[PDB]
């Protein structure tokens, strides 16, 4: 009977942090979490050192060492970390479907835009940062107009090599 965090919303929300939207194709890949803390749901991941592991640290990704994919919302995750994949757990990375993610940009994004990754934190945006600290995920595009700090769905394809931007 818990009425806390009641906002009396006009209508239903759109999605959650890492939920997918149904479509026939999806590469979902099982990896093992390597970071000491968990990994959030809609997040980018790099290639681990365990030959099948992944890390949440993408500060050193390059066109030669591209990022691995994006985690998905699992909803059965050990109930000790709130919404995360705990250490030593199947990660369920996705690299082909359409997924809801979080926007980090001042002016927001619109339907068809490039997707730029900020290597410092691992956040998605519309344009390059400008100090050799951003990559462009070459095969990727948005699918929703959204403001700053809101959820937008994007279409992703990680087999296309990334592009470095200074």
Partner 1 sequence: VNQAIMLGMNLPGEKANLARLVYERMVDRVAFTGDAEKDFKGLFNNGAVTA
Provide the minimum distance between the beta carbon of 66 and its own copies in the complex, in angstroms, as a whole number: 7
In angstroms, the CA 136 to CA 164 distance is 6
The yes or no reply on residue 161 touching its own copies (CB under 8 A) is: yes
- Site residues (vs partner 1, CB under 8 A): 11-12, 32, 50-53, 76, 87-89
The yes or no reply on residue 114 touching its own copies (CB under 8 A) is: yes
**Window 91-110: residues binding its own copies (CB under 8 A):** 96, 110
The yes or no reply on residue 60 touching its own copies (CB under 8 A) is: no
Instruction: Tell me which DSSP letter residue 112 carries.
Output: S
Provide the minimum distance between the beta carbon of 87 and partner 1 in the complex, in angstroms, as a whole number: 8
In angstroms, the CA 93 to CA 156 distance is 12
Ranges assigned E (strand) in the chain? 28-29, 32-33, 44-47, 53-55, 69-71, 93-94, 98-102, 116-118, 123-125, 134-136, 140-142, 151-156, 163-165
Give the residues lining the site for its own copies (CB under 8 A). Answer: 23-28, 47-49, 51-52, 64-66, 68, 96, 110-112, 114, 138-141, 144-145, 155, 157, 159-161
């Amino acid at each position: 009977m818990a009425p806390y965090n009641e906002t009396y919303a006009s209508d239903y929300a759109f999605a959650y942090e890492g939920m997918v939207s149904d479509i026939a194709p999806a590469d979902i890949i099982s990896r093992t979490v390597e970071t000491s803390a968990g990994i959030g749901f809609g997040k980018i991941v790099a290639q681990g050192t365990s030959d099948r592991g992944c890390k949440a640290d993408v500060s050193a990704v390059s066109p030669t060492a591209p990022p691995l994919g994006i985690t998905v919302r699992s909803q059965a995750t050990e109930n000790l970390t709130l919404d995360k994949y705990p250490r030593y757990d199947g990660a369920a990375i996705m690299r082909k479907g359409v997924i809801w993610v979080l926007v980090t940009d001042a002016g927001g994004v619109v339907a068809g835009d490039p997707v730029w990754l900020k290597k410092s934190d691992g956040t998605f945006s519309n344009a390059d940062v400008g100090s050799s600290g951003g990559l462009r995920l070459a095969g990727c595009r948005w699918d929703t107009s959204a403001a700053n700090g809101a959820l937008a769905r994007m279409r992703v394809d990680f087999d296309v090599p990334p592009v470095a931007g200074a």
